[PDB]
């Protein structure tokens, strides 16, 4: 049996005060998101539901499309 999943990301803590330059928005009801689809094209929609347990969220799209998107395929539409 294997114990390690191979590939470690961020395993060190800060020793001195460090400011935040790249902020990351959160998943909430009424959040304009960009749901990336498997066709290579992006999708615009607002958050109708949130699943912070399985890292998922439901969003209502411009063309009345209610599609379930993952927090990894989502890009907050702000800038």
């Amino acid at each position: 049996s294997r114990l390690s999943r191979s590939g470690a990301s961020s395993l060190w803590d800060p020793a001195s005060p460090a400011p935040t330059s790249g902020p990351r928005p959160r998943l909430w009801e009424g959040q304009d998101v960009l749901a990336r689809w498997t066709d290579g094209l992006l999708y615009l929609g607002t958050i109708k539901k949130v699943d912070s347990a399985r890292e998922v969220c439901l969003v209502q799209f411009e063309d009345d499309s209610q599609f379930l998107v993952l927090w990894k395929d989502i890009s907050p539409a702000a800038l």
Partner: peptide, 11 residues
Amino acid sequence: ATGGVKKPHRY
């Protein structure tokens, strides 16, 4: 070209 439904980053 489309322009009536979703309006994401560019497409």
